[PDB]
PDB file of C-alpha atoms in Angstrom:
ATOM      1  CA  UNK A   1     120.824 124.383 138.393  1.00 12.33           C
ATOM      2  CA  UNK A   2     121.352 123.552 141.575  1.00 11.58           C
ATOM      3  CA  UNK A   3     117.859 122.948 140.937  1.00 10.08           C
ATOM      4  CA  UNK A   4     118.878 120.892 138.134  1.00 13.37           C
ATOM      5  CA  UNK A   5     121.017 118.837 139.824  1.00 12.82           C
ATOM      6  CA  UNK A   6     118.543 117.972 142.275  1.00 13.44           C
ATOM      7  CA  UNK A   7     116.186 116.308 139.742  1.00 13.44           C
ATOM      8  CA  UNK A   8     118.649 114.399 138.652  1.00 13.39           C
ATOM      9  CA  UNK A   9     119.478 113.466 141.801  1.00 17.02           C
ATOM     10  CA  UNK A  10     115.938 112.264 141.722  1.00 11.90           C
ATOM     11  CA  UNK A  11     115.902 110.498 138.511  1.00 11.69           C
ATOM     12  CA  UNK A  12     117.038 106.996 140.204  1.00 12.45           C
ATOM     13  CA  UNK A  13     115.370 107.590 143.552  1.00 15.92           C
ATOM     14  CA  UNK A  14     112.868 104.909 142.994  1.00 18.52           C
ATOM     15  CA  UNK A  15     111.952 101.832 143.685  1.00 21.30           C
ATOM     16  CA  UNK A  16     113.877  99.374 141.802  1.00 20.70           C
ATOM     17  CA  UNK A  17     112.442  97.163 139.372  1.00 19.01           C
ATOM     18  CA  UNK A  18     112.238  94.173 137.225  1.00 18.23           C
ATOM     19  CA  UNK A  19     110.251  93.908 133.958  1.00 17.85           C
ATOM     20  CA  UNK A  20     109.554  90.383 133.158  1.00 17.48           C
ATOM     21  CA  UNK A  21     108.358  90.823 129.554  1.00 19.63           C
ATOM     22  CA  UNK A  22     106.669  92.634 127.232  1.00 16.41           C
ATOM     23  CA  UNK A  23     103.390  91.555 128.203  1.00 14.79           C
ATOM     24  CA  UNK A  24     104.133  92.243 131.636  1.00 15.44           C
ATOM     25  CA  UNK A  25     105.659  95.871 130.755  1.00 10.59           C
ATOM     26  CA  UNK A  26     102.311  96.666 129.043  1.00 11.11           C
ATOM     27  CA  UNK A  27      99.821  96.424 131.691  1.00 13.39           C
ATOM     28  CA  UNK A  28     102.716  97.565 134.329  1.00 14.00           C
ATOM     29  CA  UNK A  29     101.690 101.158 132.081  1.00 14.48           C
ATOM     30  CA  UNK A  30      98.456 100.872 131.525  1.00 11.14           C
ATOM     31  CA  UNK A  31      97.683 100.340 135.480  1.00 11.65           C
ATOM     32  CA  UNK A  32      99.998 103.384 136.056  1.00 10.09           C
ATOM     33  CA  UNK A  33      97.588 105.378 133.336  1.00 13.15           C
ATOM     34  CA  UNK A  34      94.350 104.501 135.348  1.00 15.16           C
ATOM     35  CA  UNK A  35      96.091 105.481 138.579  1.00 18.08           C
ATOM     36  CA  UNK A  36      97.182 109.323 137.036  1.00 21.57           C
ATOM     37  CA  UNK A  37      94.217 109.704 135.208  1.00 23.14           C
ATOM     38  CA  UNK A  38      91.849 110.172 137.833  1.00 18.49           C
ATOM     39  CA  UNK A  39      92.984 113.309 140.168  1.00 19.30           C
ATOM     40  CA  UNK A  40      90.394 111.569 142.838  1.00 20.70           C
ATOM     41  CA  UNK A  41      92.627 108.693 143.345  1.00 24.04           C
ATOM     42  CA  UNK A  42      95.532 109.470 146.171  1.00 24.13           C
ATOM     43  CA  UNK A  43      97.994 111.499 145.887  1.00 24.38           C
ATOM     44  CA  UNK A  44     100.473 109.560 147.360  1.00 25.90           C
ATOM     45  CA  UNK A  45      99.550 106.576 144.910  1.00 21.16           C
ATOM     46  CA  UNK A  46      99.914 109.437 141.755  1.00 19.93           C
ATOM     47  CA  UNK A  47     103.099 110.759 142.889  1.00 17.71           C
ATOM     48  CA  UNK A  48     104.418 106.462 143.343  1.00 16.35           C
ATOM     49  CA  UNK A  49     103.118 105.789 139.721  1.00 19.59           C
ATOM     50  CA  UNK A  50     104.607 108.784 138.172  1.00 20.40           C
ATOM     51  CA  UNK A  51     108.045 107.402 139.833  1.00 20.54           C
ATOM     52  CA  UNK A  52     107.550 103.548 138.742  1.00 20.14           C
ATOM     53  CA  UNK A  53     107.555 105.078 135.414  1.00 23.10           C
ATOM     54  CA  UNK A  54     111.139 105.663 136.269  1.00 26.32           C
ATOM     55  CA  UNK A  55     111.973 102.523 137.770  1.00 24.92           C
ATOM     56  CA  UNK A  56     110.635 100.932 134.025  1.00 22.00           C
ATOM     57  CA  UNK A  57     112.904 103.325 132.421  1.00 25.02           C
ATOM     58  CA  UNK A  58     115.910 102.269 134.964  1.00 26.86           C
ATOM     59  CA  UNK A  59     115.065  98.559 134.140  1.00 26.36           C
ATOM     60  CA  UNK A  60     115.212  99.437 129.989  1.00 24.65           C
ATOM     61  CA  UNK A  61     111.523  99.850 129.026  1.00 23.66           C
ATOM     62  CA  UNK A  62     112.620 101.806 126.468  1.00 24.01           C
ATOM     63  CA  UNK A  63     114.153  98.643 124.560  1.00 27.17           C
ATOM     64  CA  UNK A  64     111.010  96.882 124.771  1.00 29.96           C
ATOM     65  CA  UNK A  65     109.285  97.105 120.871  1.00 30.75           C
ATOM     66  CA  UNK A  66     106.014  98.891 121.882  1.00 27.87           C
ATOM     67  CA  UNK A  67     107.161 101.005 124.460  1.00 24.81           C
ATOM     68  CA  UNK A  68     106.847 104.008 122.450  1.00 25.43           C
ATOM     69  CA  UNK A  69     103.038 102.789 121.807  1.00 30.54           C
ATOM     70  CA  UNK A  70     102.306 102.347 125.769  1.00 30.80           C
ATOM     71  CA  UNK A  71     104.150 106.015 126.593  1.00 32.11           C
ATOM     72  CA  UNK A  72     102.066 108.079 124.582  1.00 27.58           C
ATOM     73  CA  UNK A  73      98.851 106.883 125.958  1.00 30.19           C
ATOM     74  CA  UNK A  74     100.243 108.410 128.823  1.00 31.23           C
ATOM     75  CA  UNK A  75      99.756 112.106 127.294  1.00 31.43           C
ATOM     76  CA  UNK A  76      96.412 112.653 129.256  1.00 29.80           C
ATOM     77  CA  UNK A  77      97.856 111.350 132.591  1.00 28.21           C
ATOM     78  CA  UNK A  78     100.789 113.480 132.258  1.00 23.92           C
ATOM     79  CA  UNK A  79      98.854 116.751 131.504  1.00 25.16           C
ATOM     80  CA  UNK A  80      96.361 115.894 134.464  1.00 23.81           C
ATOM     81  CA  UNK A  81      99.652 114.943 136.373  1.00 22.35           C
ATOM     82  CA  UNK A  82     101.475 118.360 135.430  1.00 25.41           C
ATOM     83  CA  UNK A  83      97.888 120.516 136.675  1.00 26.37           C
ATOM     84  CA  UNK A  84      97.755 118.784 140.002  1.00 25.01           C
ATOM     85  CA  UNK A  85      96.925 121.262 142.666  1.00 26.09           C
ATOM     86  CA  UNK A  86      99.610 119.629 144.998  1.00 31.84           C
ATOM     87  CA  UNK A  87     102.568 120.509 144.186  1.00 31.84           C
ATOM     88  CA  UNK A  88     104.106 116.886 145.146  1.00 33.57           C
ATOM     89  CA  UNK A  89     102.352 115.252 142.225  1.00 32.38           C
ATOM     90  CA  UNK A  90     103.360 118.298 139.785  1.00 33.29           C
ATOM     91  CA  UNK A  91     107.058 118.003 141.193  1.00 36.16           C
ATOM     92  CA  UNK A  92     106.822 114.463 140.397  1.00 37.17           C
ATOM     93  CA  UNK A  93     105.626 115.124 137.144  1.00 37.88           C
ATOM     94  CA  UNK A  94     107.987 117.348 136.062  1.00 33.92           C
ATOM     95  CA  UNK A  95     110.990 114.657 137.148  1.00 33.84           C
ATOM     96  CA  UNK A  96     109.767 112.078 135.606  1.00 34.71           C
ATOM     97  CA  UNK A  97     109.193 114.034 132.592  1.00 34.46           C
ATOM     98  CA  UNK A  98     112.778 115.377 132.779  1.00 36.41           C
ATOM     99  CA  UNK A  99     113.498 111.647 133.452  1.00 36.93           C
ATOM    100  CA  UNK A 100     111.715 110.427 130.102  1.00 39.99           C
ATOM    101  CA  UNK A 101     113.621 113.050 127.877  1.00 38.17           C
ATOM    102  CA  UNK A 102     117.308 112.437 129.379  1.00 35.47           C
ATOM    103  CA  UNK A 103     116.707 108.477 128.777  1.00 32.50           C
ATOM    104  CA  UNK A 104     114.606 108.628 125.407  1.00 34.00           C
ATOM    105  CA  UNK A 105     116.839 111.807 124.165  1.00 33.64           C
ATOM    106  CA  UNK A 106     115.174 112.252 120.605  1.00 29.25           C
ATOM    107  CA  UNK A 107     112.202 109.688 120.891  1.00 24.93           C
ATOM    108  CA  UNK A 108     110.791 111.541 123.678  1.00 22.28           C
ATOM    109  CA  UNK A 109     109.436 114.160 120.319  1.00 20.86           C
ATOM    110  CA  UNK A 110     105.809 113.277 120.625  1.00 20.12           C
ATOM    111  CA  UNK A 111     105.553 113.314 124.521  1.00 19.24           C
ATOM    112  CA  UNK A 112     107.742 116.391 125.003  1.00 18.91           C
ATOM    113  CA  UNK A 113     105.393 118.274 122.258  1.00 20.11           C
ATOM    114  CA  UNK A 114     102.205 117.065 123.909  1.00 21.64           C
ATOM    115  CA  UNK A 115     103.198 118.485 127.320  1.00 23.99           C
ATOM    116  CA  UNK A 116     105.425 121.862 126.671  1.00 22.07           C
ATOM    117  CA  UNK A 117     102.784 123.949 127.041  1.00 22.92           C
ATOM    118  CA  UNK A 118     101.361 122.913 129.978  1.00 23.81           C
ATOM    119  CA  UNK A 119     104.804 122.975 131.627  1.00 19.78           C
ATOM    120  CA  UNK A 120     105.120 126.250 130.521  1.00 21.51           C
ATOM    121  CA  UNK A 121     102.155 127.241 132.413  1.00 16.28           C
ATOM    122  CA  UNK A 122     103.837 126.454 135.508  1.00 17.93           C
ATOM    123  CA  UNK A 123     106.424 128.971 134.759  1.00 13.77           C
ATOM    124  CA  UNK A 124     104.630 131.753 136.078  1.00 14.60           C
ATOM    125  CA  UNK A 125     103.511 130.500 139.207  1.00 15.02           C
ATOM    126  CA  UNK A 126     104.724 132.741 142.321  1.00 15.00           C
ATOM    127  CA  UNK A 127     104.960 129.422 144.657  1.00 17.23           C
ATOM    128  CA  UNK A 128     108.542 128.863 144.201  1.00 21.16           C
ATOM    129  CA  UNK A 129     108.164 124.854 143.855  1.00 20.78           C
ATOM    130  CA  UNK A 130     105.849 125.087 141.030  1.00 19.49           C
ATOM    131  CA  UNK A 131     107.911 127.538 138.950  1.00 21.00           C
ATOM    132  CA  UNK A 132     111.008 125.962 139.456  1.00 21.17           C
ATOM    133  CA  UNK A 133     109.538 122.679 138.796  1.00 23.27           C
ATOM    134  CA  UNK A 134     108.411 123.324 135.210  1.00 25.85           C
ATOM    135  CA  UNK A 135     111.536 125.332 134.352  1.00 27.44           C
ATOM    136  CA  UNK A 136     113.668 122.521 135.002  1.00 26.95           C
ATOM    137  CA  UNK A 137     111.437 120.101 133.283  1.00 27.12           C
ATOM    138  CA  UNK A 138     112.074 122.348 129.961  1.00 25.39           C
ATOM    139  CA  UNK A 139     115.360 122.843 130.610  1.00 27.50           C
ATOM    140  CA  UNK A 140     116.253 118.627 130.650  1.00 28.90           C
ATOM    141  CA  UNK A 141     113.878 118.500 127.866  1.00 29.36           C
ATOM    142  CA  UNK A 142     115.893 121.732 125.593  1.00 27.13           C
ATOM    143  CA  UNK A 143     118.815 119.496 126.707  1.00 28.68           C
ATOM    144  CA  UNK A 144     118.040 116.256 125.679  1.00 30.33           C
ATOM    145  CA  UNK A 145     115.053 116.172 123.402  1.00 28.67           C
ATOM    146  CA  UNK A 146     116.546 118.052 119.832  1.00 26.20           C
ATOM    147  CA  UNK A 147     113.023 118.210 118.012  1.00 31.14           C
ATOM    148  CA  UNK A 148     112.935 121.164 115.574  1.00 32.82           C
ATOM    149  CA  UNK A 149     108.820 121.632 116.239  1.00 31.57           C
ATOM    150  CA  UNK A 150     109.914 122.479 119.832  1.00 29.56           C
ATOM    151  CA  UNK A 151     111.526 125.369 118.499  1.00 26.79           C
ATOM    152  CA  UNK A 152     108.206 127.599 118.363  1.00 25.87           C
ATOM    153  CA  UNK A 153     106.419 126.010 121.216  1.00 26.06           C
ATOM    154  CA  UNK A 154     109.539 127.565 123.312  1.00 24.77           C
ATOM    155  CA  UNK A 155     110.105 131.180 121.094  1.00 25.60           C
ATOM    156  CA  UNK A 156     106.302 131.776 121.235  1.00 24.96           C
ATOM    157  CA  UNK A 157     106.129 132.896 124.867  1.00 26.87           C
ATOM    158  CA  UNK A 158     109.109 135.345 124.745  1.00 29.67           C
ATOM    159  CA  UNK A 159     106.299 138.039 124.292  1.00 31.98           C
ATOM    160  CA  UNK A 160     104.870 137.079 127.806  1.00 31.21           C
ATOM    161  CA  UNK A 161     102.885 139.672 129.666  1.00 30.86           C
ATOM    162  CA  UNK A 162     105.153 138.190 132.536  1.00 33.93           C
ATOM    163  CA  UNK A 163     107.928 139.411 132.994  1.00 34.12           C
ATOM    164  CA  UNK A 164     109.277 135.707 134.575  1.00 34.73           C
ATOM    165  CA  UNK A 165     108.220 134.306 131.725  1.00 35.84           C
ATOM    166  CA  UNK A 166     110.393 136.180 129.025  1.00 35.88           C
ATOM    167  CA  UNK A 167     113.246 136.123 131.148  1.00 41.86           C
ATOM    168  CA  UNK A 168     112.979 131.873 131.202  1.00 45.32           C
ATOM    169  CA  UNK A 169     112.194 131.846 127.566  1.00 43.99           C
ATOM    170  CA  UNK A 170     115.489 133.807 126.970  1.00 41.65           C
ATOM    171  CA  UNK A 171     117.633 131.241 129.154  1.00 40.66           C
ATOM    172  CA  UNK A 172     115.419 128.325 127.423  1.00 41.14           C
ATOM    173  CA  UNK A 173     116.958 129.916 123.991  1.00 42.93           C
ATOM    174  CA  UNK A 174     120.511 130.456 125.346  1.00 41.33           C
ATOM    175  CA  UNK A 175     120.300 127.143 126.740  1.00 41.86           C
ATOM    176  CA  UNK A 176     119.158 125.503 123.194  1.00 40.83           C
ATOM    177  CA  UNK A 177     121.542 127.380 120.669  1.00 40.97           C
ATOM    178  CA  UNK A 178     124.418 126.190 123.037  1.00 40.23           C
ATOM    179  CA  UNK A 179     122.795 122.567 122.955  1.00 35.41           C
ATOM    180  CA  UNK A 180     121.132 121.794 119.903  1.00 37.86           C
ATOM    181  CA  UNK A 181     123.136 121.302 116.870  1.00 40.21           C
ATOM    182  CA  UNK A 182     123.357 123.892 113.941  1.00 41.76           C
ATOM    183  CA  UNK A 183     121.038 121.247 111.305  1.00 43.04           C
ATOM    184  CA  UNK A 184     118.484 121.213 114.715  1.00 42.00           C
ATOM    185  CA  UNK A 185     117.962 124.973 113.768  1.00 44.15           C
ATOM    186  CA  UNK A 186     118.108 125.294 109.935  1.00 43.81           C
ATOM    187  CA  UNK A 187     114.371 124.865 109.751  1.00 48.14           C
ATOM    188  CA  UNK A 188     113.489 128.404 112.130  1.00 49.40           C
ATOM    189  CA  UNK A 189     115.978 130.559 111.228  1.00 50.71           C
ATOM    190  CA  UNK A 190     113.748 133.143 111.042  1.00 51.13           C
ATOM    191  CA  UNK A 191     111.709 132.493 114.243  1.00 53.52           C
ATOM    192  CA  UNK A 192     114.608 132.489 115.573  1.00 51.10           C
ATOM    193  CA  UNK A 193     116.346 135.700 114.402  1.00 53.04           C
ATOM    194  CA  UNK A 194     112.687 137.190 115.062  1.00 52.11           C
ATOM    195  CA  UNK A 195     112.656 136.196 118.884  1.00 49.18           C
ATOM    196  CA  UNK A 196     116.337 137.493 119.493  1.00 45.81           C
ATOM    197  CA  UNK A 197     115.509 140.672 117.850  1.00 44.81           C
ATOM    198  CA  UNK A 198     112.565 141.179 119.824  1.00 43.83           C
ATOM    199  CA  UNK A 199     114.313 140.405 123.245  1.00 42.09           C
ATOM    200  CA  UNK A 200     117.161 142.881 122.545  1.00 37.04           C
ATOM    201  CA  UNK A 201     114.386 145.550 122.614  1.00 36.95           C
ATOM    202  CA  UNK A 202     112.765 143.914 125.670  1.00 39.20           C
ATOM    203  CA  UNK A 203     111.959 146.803 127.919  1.00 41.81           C
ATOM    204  CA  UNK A 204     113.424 144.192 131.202  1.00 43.86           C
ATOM    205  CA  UNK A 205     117.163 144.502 131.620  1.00 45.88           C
ATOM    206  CA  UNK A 206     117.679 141.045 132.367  1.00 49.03           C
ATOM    207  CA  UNK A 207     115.140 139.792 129.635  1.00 49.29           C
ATOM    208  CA  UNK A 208     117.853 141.726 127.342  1.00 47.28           C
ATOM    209  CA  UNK A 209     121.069 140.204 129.047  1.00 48.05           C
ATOM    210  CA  UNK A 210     119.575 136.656 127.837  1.00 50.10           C
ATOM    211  CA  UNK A 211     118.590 137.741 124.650  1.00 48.33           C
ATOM    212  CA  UNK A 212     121.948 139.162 124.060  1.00 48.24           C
ATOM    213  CA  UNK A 213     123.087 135.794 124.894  1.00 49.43           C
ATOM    214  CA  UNK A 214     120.884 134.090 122.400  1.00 49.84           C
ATOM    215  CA  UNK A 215     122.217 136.610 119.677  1.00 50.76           C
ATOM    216  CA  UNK A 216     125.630 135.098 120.163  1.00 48.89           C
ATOM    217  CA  UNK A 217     124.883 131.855 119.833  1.00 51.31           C
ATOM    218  CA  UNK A 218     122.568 132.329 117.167  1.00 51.10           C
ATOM    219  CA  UNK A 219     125.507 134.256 114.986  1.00 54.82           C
ATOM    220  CA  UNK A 220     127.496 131.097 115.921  1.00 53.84           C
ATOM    221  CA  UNK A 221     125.309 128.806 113.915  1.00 51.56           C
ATOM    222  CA  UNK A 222     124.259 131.395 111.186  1.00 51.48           C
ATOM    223  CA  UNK A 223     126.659 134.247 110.689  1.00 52.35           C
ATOM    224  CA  UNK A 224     125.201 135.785 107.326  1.00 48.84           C
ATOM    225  CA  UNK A 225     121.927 135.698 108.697  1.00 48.37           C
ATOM    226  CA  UNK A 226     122.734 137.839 112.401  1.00 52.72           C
ATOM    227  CA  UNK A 227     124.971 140.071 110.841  1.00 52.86           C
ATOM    228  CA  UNK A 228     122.043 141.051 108.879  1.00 50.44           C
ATOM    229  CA  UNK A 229     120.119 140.576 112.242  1.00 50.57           C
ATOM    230  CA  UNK A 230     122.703 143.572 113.479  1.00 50.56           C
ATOM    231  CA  UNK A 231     122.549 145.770 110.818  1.00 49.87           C
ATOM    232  CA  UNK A 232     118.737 146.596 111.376  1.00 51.23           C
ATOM    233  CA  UNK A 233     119.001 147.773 114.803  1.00 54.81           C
ATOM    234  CA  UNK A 234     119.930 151.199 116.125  1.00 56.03           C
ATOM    235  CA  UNK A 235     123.196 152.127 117.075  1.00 56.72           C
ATOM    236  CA  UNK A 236     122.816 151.905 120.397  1.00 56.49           C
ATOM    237  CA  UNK A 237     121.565 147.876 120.800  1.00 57.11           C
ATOM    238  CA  UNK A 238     124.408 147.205 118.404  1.00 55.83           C
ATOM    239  CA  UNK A 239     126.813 148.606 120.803  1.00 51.64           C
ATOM    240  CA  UNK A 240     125.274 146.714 123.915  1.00 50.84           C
ATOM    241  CA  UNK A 241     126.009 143.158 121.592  1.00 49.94           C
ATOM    242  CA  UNK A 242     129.270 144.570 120.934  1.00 48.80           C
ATOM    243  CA  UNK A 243     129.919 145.204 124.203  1.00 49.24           C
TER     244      UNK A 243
END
């Protein structure tokens, strides 16, 4: 969060630029896709391209009419981007990305559902850099990108083997019932009443101080359905929510 702020921070730390037209815009992307899509070609160059795709956003790419069409052939580079073995390309990856959703907001769907899971694979990673990296890219994303399809991408790895994992998936679902409005939700009301009921149980304390987060602001957008939600657990959970 601190964290967070930093990649903002980073957002406009480019180079600025000027986009002359569309034409120009177009292969402007498509030489930036041939630079990220081979992990032989310099790092240095990689981690530059991934921020010139910032410097295009700073100078309104996004209100050029087949933006939308250039971005998404971008999926493979960002993947390839977001597996680097350096951790200054992955960084970069992960602010831009962030970048992308905060500026796009809603038409960032398609890109942010192409690359969620392989942020999430970061997530895990005991070099601090490379954790912290992909949670913040899902955090901006949670915050800016309200795409009901997200919804499972993010509950599906609160059953984690890691321990790190569930935790972040818990403050990913905190995070996204106090973002996301309540018509955002009415789709996985289930998955999401599922999730929360699982974490309450989670055998990690702090996995269980999220979740018990997530239960409030789940009953805040869906009352009938987590008092329910409360009224299948044993005494003792329902006393920790009360609590």
């Amino acid at each position: 969060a601190v964290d967070e702020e930093d990649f903002i921070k980073a957002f406009d730390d480019v180079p600025v630029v000027q986009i002359y037209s569309s034409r120009d815009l177009e292969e402007s992307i498509n030489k930036i896709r041939e630079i990220l899509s081979d992990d032989k070609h310099d790092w240095e160059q990689r981690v530059n391209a991934l921020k010139k795709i910032r410097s295009l956003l700073l100078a309104g790419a996004a209100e050029y009419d087949n933006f939308f069409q250039h971005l998404r052939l971008l999926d493979g580079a960002f993947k390839l981007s977001a597996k680097d073995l350096r951790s200054q390309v992955v960084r970069e990856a992960c602010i831009t990305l962030g970048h992308l959703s905060s500026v796009l907001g809603n038409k960032f769907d398609h890109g942010a559902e192409a690359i969620m899971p392989t942020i999430f694979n970061l997530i895990p990673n005991s070099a601090k850099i490379m954790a912290t990296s992909g949670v913040v890219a899902v955090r901006l994303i949670i915050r800016h990108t309200h795409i009901p399809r997200l919804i499972p991408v993010i509950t599906s790895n609160c059953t984690s083997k890691s321990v790190a994992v569930r935790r972040r998936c818990f403050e990913f679902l905190d995070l996204l019932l106090q973002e996301w409005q309540t018509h955002s939700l009415e789709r996985h009301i289930s998955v999401l009443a599922e999730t929360i009921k699982k974490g309450i149980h989670d055998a990690d304390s702090e996995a269980r101080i999220e979740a018990r987060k997530c239960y409030w602001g789940f009953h805040s957008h869906f009352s009938r359905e987590a008092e329910h939600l409360y009224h299948t657990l044993e005494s003792s959970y329902q006393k920790a929510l009360q609590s």
